[PDB]
Design a protein around this motif. Sequence first.
Motif, mmCIF file in Angstrom:
data_model
loop_
_atom_site.group_PDB
_atom_site.id
_atom_site.type_symbol
_atom_site.label_atom_id
_atom_site.label_comp_id
_atom_site.label_asym_id
_atom_site.label_seq_id
_atom_site.Cartn_x
_atom_site.Cartn_y
_atom_site.Cartn_z
ATOM 1 N N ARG A 19 1.058 -1.125 0.118
ATOM 2 C CA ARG A 19 0.062 -0.006 -0.105
ATOM 3 C C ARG A 19 0.920 1.205 -0.160
ATOM 4 O O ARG A 19 1.757 1.581 0.741
ATOM 5 N N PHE A 20 0.617 2.173 -1.016
ATOM 6 C CA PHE A 20 1.360 3.543 -1.201
ATOM 7 C C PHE A 20 0.487 4.622 -0.845
ATOM 8 O O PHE A 20 -0.933 4.557 -1.255
ATOM 9 N N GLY A 21 1.077 5.693 -0.187
ATOM 10 C CA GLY A 21 0.288 6.978 0.010
ATOM 11 C C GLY A 21 0.179 7.859 -1.070
ATOM 12 O O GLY A 21 0.428 7.407 -2.264
ATOM 13 N N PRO A 22 0.012 9.149 -1.185
ATOM 14 C CA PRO A 22 -0.061 9.976 -2.352
ATOM 15 C C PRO A 22 1.402 10.310 -2.793
ATOM 16 O O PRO A 22 1.981 11.519 -2.480
ATOM 17 N N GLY A 23 2.034 9.220 -3.234
ATOM 18 C CA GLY A 23 3.409 9.516 -3.636
ATOM 19 C C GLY A 23 3.435 9.941 -5.188
ATOM 20 O O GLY A 23 2.783 9.256 -5.997
#
Length: 23
Positions: A19-23
């Motif tokens: 899971r990745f954030g607002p990258g």
Amino acid sequence: YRQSSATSSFGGLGGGSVRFGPG
């Protein structure tokens, strides 16, 4: 030896997608 699927920590990629954030 309990035939564990995985051991230690490595991001849990095998368990599922990372899971990745607002990258």
